Amino acid sequence: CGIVGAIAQRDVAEILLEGLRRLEYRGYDSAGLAVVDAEGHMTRLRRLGKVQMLAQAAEEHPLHGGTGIAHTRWATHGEPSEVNAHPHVSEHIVVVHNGIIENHEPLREELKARGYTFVSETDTEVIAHLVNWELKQGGTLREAVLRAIPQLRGAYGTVIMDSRHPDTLLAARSGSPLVIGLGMGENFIASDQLALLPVTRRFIFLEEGDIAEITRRSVNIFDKTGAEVKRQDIESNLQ
């Protein structure tokens, strides 16, 4: 339901939690976040329940790290439970996802043959394992995600990270909104500009089919053929 992600020099957990607070009004059954520090140490915290519960859990875990993604979930596939909450993982691959992967069944079956254990009942978990799978075939996270995305069917928005290389976030808009917020030496992404207003007012709205590679210093957006596309940033007048 709500996605927020950030890639910064400063710790981003508090920014992710504030963004999720801003996305609650939409409604949801659970929420989670994962942050990775510069050494690739990932901390993931999820809760069945409200962001406030997640925030209270985070208070006893000071999550350090400048790369992170967070999500509030309105369950479609798999009952609300902590196991099914996002972020989902596949070793170092961590994903948050809005929407539905229509063809999750056949995909889940392939990945099971490839030796992947599904721990959740979500369609989402297929994204994580599949990117893990593609990445094993060689190349950067961007290249792996360019191969993964066309295999996915449905109306979805996803942000992916590799905890081993916390310097890049990949995001793909494919039926669900995502917008990039531009910072000074940091960048953010959310499913709604409203989440990011406390830290930036300058946005790039991704378009349908866009895949964005986001680092602290650059945003590069591509279509599914790997062609670079140019998207304009705009200043938001909202408060």
Ligand X SMILES: N[C@@H](CCC(=O)NO)C(=O)O
Q: How far is the CB of 78 from ligand X (least distance, A)?
A: 6
- Annotated active-site residue 25? The verdict is no
Nearer to its own copies, 186 or 210 (CB): 186
Report the residue from 8, 89, 149, 219 that binds its own copies according to the rule CB under 8 A. 8
DSSP 139-189: S-HHHHHHHHGGG--SSEEEEEEETTSTT-EEEEEEBS--EEEE-SS-EEE
* 31 contacts 51 by C-beta, under 8 angstroms: yes
Q: How far is the CB of 167 from Na ion (least distance, A)?
A: 27
Convert residues 11-40 into a mask of x (bound to its own copies by CB under 8 A) and - (unbound).
x--xx--x----------------------
Residue 98 DSSP SS3: strand
Report the residue from 57, 83, 194, 199 that binds its own copies according to the rule CB under 8 A. 199
Q: Among the options 1, 17, 141, 221, which is catalytic?
A: 1
Q: Does 32 contact ligand X by CB under 6 A?
A: no
Residue 10 DSSP SS3: coil
Q: Does 4 contact its own copies by CB under 8 A?
A: no
* Beta bridge partner(s), residue 157: 98, 173
Judged by CB under 8 A, the stretch of 6-14, 69-77, 118-126, 163-171 that binds its own copies is: 6-14
- Tokens representing 116 are 């992947």
Residue 97 DSSP SS3: strand
- Return the closest-CA partner of residue 192 out of 214, 213, 173: 173
Report the residue from 43, 90, 124, 163 that binds ligand X according to the rule CB under 6 A. 124
* Beta bridge partner(s), residue 38: none
Choose among its own copies, ligand X, Na ion, none what residue 123 binds, the Cβ cut-off being 5 to 8 Å by kind: ligand X
What single-letter amino acid sits at 77?
H
**Site size with ligand X, rule: CB under 6 A:** 14
Residues with catalytic roles: 1
